[PDB]
Write an enzyme that holds these catalytic residues in place. Sequence first.
Site: not given
Ligand SMILES: Nc1ncnc2c1ncn2[C@@H]1O[C@H](CSCC[C@H](N)C(=O)O)[C@@H](O)[C@H]1O
Length: 430
Positions: A231
Amino acid sequence: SLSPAVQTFWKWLQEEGVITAKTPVKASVVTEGLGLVALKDISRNDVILQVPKRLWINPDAVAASEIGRVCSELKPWLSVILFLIRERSREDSVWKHYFGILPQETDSTIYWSEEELQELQGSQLLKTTVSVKEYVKNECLKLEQEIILPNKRLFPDPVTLDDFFWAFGILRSRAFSRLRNENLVVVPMADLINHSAGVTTEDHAYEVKDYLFSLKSPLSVKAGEQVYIQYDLNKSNAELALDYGFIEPNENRHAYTLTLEISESDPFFDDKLDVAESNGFAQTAYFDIFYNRTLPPGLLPYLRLVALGGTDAFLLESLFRDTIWGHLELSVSRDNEELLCKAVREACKSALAGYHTTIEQDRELKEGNLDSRLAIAVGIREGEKMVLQQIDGIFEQKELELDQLEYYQERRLKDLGLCGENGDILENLY
Ligand SMILES: Nc1ncnc2c1ncn2[C@@H]1O[C@H](CSCC[C@H](N)C(=O)O)[C@@H](O)[C@H]1O
């Protein structure tokens, strides 16, 4: 056993020409919510998915909609929020199924309850999130009275803060900005690829290329494993916390930003401000301090400028308006150095006393199982206490080495040439 809404969203992307027959990636429920699990062996740079500009949700999209008229002056994000909020309610919205997948909340500190926020007591992250929630609040109540209310036609249903924050969140946790010429884009498909410290290349695994959002997998992913991306290599943990609902264990992400400013109550304001700007610094300047990194260039000179004082005021004169920064960079005087050191040190001690837990308690807690939000609070407040203590240490050292530095006066007499020649001999030769 996946999910109903997910079931639909997957279909809707087939019925748009996004997910073709060749897409080595299906959606699945991962620890981080929803993610993209490789449908088969993928390789580095192997394009994972592509989306048509037809499906972005950027400022150009809001400008090409019914409200683009009224939002013509609004900043880009404010415009997307209203667009997001609005599209959200429209039964005929293009993102009807995409909005059907969006989690109503992430673990960003913007959604934390008051108790949950107490866990961040004294933390800069708290000061920052509070400060951000408020600003986004006032800027949205301002939109309510300048665009929303005056146009009850375009905005049918009422809009509450929970609606704004929902949008401000979806935007800040999903928008791909590292894109070129589009610094705020929401792409429904690639919106599911989660973050991983495993990816270290970064620099947009995605690219603008109908139009498309060709997103290429940065890592070789074997069949069944989730596809990830970096990210942001530069964001601090405090930033990852607010921007998305997570932080990394990596202590190198811990940062604490110091804010310096040339107060207007300073008797030499005008001259100091003059020197600061002549060298790239404003009246107020923010210096980000990361764990285990060397102090930002300029922090010291700016600190020395801020603490200048009447004794060394001569350095502000025109005579030095060309070397003054070089001198600030080197050092001004023991009195000046000592002063700034106490100021920085006292601020750290003062700041550290603001937290409600010791670093030992935070680390002991990290040794158990913590819910997402507490884990974030503990992790962030531990890091801040680490940086804060690091800074205090760096300057406690400076206080001892307060005499090893060769300040301005010494540097001036370094070239005196007392032991030259007996010049009087030549004086009498003419
Ligand atoms: N490595 C990580 N650890 C924890 N939460 C994560 C993460 N990468 C992504 N996320 C979560 O996913 C969001 C990014 S958008 C990714 C899609 C999301 N996982 C969904 O279920 O719709 C973040 O704001 C966070 O809440």
